[PDB]
Design a protein around this ligand. Structure first.
Ligand SMILES: CC(=O)c1sc(CCOP(=O)(O)OP(=O)(O)O)c(C)[n+]1Cc1cnc(C)nc1N
Ligand SMILES: CC(=O)c1sc(CCOP(=O)(O)OP(=O)(O)O)c(C)[n+]1Cc1cnc(C)nc1N
Ligand SMILES: [Mg+2]
Ligand SMILES: [Mg+2]
Ligand code: NA
Lengths: 802, 802
């Protein structure tokens, strides 16, 4: 248990705490300006001149003094209440507030011993910000106290609410830009309070950083009427409180006392909600939120060159852009740094004075030290059930290609038992698709968590105010909740229709970037559990939907995060349920990855046993010898290679036909896609020798690929024999139609695969047979048109091993 | 002018109109069930049996009777008020409501003559829905009256509000799923009413289709308290009205009269707002919105197999899934179809009776016929200014590589004058980045349109309640507004930081799919203007930001929509401002495309004259002979090829060094990326002969690519000499740093490009020189570390032609 969660003070904030908060705010403002502007001389010792100013002024001042103000008050609150707290910096371009916070709390020097608490350390701290060989502009994973960089705006609230799930002692004050709140993902993020429970989860306090402006415009929320703004927050289930400061001559000590009093009222309300929830955990409370309305750039010069800067979008990036080049900008910068009176904040040796930090929290309550902001220090491996009990044993009892299994049901049973064994640290998210993607065996041990109105057991099934599945029709919510759940040390999976995974392409990019920086150069940030995404209801079998639901292209995006041997991204094609099981075990053990797990949910053959699945997965691609009819690679006339359940089924049927014609071939299944890249691009891929062994040195290879052929073509560009691969992938064809028709129109069906294999082998010799196969595809299509279902010869085919 | 816009009735809805609306609702419900369930016998003529039921039951009943109800009332409103109207079907899986609407209004038979108004036509209409060789499950572009398919949910409101921009006579009732409203893009879509003007734009009426459920869950909005729901809509600037029906025994005629009365109150309020806006166009009104709360699946069987179906998520997809296989489901289906009393709705010949449609609008007011729902019939070519006046003439006067131009400023001036010449049909959208991406010369002739509070001319600049630029910090808004603006026949452009274009990857996918279906098989849907996206502030020069802002990967997504010779996607690399001008002219003339226009906004050399730009763009890739020093291709030791402003600059400097060493090479610039594909994949690409002429038959080619190397590798897979290309692209390296450092760490800098060219030519011979270049890159990096700016030898280099 960290601290004493949810305790009220029952006395006023002390005057010593007010004095310390004002010094915090002045020293963090001063050092934020130092990080942006100063390459040397951080205490302005004589002579302080333009030569001390950075040659390239980069950074964002506008948000920063508002963040520094809130962080003074959040620090005071954590110390007085001993409250387990992680904050979210929505405007993550306010990096200097976050580095300053860590430098003040002592964690920065603890993690970065060269950046010491004295004048030499402070000089290095100023220079390094946004500087070559230094540190980032944003609140990056290398900053103690960050679980959210806030570079690509919009995810502040999903991360805040995922952090508090199953974390009942955790308080998250979530600072949201008012520009940020105009994004789609942030606007739906407010609604998360219908999906958390005040007893079993922790508490988010949204703080709208309503500074009136984004980059070059006012914000929507800052210019609507007060009555609309309050109605908006009340309508989303909050009790809105509003603070307004900095727009008149009120002295800063008075402002601190008024804010401290308000923040105590708000926290007392949060403690009352927490206490009440021990008895009534079914009534959704109106959680407080805070409208924090202060001038953008607060405390910078009001006008610069006759233009209003404090209280304007003009304060957004770097005021006084000429501070190094003109004595006029320099004199302004000097007056501004001096206005904080650093001679009262730092000792002669350059260390921040003790009376600046006596009010601060200590130990693991510090924002920089709390282990929820470095959740791999809290993370424990899952207690996983034995995989063998889930195996589809039909392959062993009856043969390769047996049965009509819906593959994700086996993952569902495995998930059900993982939740049983790990009942408060493994969650499933879904955008109203958990049952549709066949993971609903989980409901046998838990419910979907819904903290909003109930009506009747005639409609409400498998839903309760607490549970370990969460659904909302938003891929951004599901991805953001899960990411923060992992970042705070827990585990999970989500599932999406494949075409709609693209809604969160950019979130996958940012989380991959977080992982890249971490595996490269942040070894104190310990490994977290991986994002596991079941990519299902795929391009080939969207029976009730049509062409909008046909886009397997998240493969292509994921390929753009496969560099430097970071190994933070995996693309797996689950050939059947036994393979899905073997892939899911590996993913649930893995850390510091995004794992995209492709599996069809339609009834489909099972090809491999679980033991075979375990070996083949490890290799990445495997010959299926029981399906090949060639002696050795020299006898092979063509290599039949597939990735994905549907291409494999069609390839298998084509193999059966090619066997009966007396054609010699081998069958290769590909599960771990990026293991096709060369060793030069991927030090864990198949070696050239293993790659040649599978694909031959010079035989043609027909490769039936689940997604866009482009992906495989680009991955295998420097591989031996790559000029002989003919990759058949999805090619933007299809509609609402029968299963045969969907493969037919992308040349993916068994008949077209058999034809392509014959064309690769000898086009002239097989000219007639190819015509005949192409005519059968027309006949089969006409059959479907006339009759309403596919031709029995297609649907009724079972691999001859069965 | 279509109809008589914004006219009140000032009498009650007639009883004849109520009777006609009830018959509409019954016949469209009946035919919706017919489309889902029936392969033959649409009038249930003796014998009606299981054999008439489809073998594959696919489709979505739950949303559909609510849509059919609203469409009866929207049709009545259009007819009585003669109101120019396009609706948006948010729940686009209710395709049968949209096809039924067109079949009733007569447009379906007008566009599809085989689907006649009689029993034979009705049989074909039922069978074809969601059927092989038939039509889609959703409200697809092939349905008259659609500008929004609603497959990937969330974009209903951005499309509605973009439709009404500069369209002051247009009314858009926008039907939003209540599941849909849990998405991010929909949640921010409500806020658009701060960005439209009630005088110069038309009016959206959001209708929340609050049927209580999504697929397998209730919805957030349906289960919060009524007071929260109303406060929510009032807080977003609406006057909420709520209708509740279908939950008790109220007869359907009574329900129609109550709704008609309410819908007249709402429309009268919209007419009052429109009238008032002729005098006060600065006060933002509270626009009506409608909460429409009815049971999901309304009018289907209340219970099926003991499970509540009407008023449940269970009604979502296909009730009575056994209707063909069991007499029990069949008897239920039969009673349900009979409950609509089709013997009163159709004549003996199977035509829908005249008294079913006497209340309907006629001519171009019909929802299926209105030209705003087929805007290429309204679209006129832009009156474009002459391009030559914008040319950067520095190249002609001083030489190739001259000056420090910020390329998008020339596009800004060109846009400024396009708006001048087309002052109400060309708009610019930006997610608070218009000025940041340097398109702010447009503000010389128009303002950013902002219909929310003003404070002071000290902060409000270039903003007014009407104008042709719109900004909101949401890529989903900018993309959705623009798409509908084009779909209703107008023109525009938007700009985004390149990394954040990924927020709307999935919207680009859907619009590409809309374009694919249209160019393939919908010739009555005439061409619309293209989506033009300035992709700027790119990976190499995000000076104030860092690694979160470094992701040029939208190239890779766009490559997945380049099939079948649809030619609906273009990727252009603007080498400099003259090239950007030549690309922008072509894009502004083009139709039925998405055009991604890559240009850097940093100060940069101009390489080509405008006449050269015009020729090279047409070819797609061009030798720059004035930069090559080889005689012919046989003399070439290496081909120096680049795409993108920054790779080209570095390649050019490498060429200068390689020239001074006595190395023989040619320079090739690539502008129109997909023209590198083979003719087999792209019938408008470079032929093999032209490709060999540029890239040689067998010399090494160093290709410095703006984005991920993977893209170029996969595109050129079947090209002559492709095994000799070495593609250098962005490889997930970089941070907040100097311009040299960002290229350095991706091996993209001039020194590394010169080294790679030497390695390709003779690794042994040049071993020492390569070491030396690699050491200079270290020295240059250390310089930046020590000094705060890049080494003068790097920054000060100008191409020797200047
Ligand atoms: C850094 C960057 O690229 C910023 S900061 C910013 C304004 C944010 O204003 P906000 O009111 O949220 O913050 P504050 O006033 O500074 O506190 C924008 C549009 N951008 C570009 C941008 C665009 N779109 C998205 C999704 N994310 C980002 N970061
Ligand atoms: C068709 C499909 O793939 C549907 S329909 C649906 C429920 C929509 O409920 P809503 O309340 O909006 O509509 P209604 O009750 O039927 O009127 C979902 C989750 N899906 C999957 C889905 C997921 N995510 C996104 C972005 N879009 C879609 N279409
Ligand atoms: Mg702001
Ligand atoms: Mg609904
Ligand atoms: Na090759």
């Amino acid at each position: 248990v960290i601290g004493t969660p949810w305790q009220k003070l029952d006395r006023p904030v002390s005057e010593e705490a007010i004095e310390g908060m004002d010094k915090y705010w002045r020293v963090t403002n001063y050092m934020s300006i130092g990080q942006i502007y100063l390459r040397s001389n951080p205490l302005m010792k004589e002579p302080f001149t333009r030569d001390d100013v950075k040659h390239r002024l980069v950074g964002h001042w506008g948000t920063t003094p508002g963040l520094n103000f809130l962080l003074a008050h959040i620090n005071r609150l954590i110390a007085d209440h001993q409250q387990n707290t992680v904050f979210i910096m929505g405007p993550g371009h306010g990096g200097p507030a976050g580095t300053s916070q860590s430098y003040v709390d002592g964690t920065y020097t603890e993690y970065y011993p060269n950046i010491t608490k004295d004048e030499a350390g402070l000089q290095k701290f100023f220079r390094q910000f946004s500087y070559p060989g230094g540190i980032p502009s944003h609140f990056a994973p290398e900053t103690p106290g960050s679980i959210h960089e806030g570079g690509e705006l919009g995810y502040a609230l999903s991360h805040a609410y995922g952090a508090v799930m199953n974390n009942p002692s955790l308080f998250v004050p979530c600072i949201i830009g008012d520009g940020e709140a105009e994004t789609g993902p942030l606007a739906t993020g407010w609604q998360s309070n219908k999906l958390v429970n005040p007893r079993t989860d922790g508490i988010v306090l949204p703080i709208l950083h309503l500074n009136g402006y984004k980059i070059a415009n006012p914000t929507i929320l800052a210019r609507i009427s007060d009555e609309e703004l309050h109605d908006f927050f009340r309508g989303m289930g909050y009790h809105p409180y509003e603070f307004v400061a900095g727009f008149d001559n009120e002295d800063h000590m008075s402002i601190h006392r008024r804010f401290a009093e308000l923040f105590e009222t708000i926290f007392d309300e949060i403690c009352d909600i927490k206490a009440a929830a021990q008895t009534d955990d079914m009534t959704r409370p109106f959680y407080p939120m805070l409208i924090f309305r202060t001038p953008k750039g607060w405390t910078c010069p009001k006008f610069i060159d006759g233009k209003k800067t404090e209280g304007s979008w003009r304060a957004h990036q770097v005021p006084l852009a000429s501070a190094r080049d003109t004595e006029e900008h320099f004199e302004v910068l000097k007056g501004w740094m001096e206005s904080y009176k650093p001679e009262e904040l730092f000792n002669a040796d350059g260390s921040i004075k003790d009376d600046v930090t006596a009010f601060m929290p200590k130990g693991e309550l510090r924002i920089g030290a709390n282990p929820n902001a470095n959740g791999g220090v809290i993370r424990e491996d899952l207690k996983l059930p034995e995989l063998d009990q889930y195996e589809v044993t039909g392959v062993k009892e009856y043969g390769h290609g047996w049965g009509q299994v819906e593959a994700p049901r086996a993952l569902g049973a495995y998930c059900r038992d993982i939740i049983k064994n790990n009942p408060d640290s493994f969650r499933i998210f879904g955008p109203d698709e958990t049952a549709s993607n066949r993971l609903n065996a989980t409901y046998e041990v838990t419910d979907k968590q819904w903290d909003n109105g109930y009506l009747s057991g005639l409609v409400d099934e498998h839903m309760a105010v607490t549970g370990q599945v969460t659904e909302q029709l938003s891929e951004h919510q599901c991805e953001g909740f899960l990411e923060a759940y992992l970042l705070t040390g827990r585990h999970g999976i989500w599932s999406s229709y494949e075409s709609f995974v693209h809604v969160i392409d950019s979130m996958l990019n940012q989380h991959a970037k977080w992982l890249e920086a971490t595996v490269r150069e942040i070894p104190w940030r310990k490994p977290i559990s991986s994002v596991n995404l079941l990519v299902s209801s795929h391009v080939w079998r969207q029976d009730h939907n049509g062409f909008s639901h046909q886009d397997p292209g998240v493969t292509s995006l994921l390929i753009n995060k496969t560099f430097n041997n970071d190994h933070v991204t995996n693309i797996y094609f689950a050939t059947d349920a036994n393979m899905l099981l073997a892939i899911s075990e590996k993913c649930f053990k893995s850390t510091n990855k995004i794992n995209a797990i492709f599996a069809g949910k339609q009834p489909a053959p099972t090809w491999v046993t679980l033991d075979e699945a375990r070996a083949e997965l490890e290799a990445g691609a495997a010959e299926w010898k029981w399906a090949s009819n060639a002696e050795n690679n020299d006898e092979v006339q063509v290599v039949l290679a597939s990735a994905g359940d549907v291409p494999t089924q069609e390839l298998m049927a084509a193999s059966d036909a090619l066997n009966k014609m007396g054609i010699k071939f081998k069958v290769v299944n590909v599960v771990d896609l990026l293991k096709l890249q060369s060793r030069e691009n991927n030090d864990e891929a198949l070696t050239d020798e293993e790659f040649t062994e599978l694909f031959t040195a010079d035989k043609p290879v027909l490769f039936a690929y689940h997604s866009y052929a482009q992906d495989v073509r680009g991955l295998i560009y420097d591989r031996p024999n790559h000029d002989n691969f003919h990759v058949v992938g999805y090619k933007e064809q299809g509609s609402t139609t029968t299963p045969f028709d969907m493969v037919r129109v992308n040349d993916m069906d068994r008949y077209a695969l058999q034809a392509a294999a014959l064309k690769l082998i000898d086009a002239d010799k097989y000219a007639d047979k190819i015509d005949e196969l192409n005519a059968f595809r027309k006949k089969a299509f006409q059959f479907a048109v006339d009759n309403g279902y596919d031709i029995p010869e297609f649907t009724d085919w079972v691999y001859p091993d069965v």
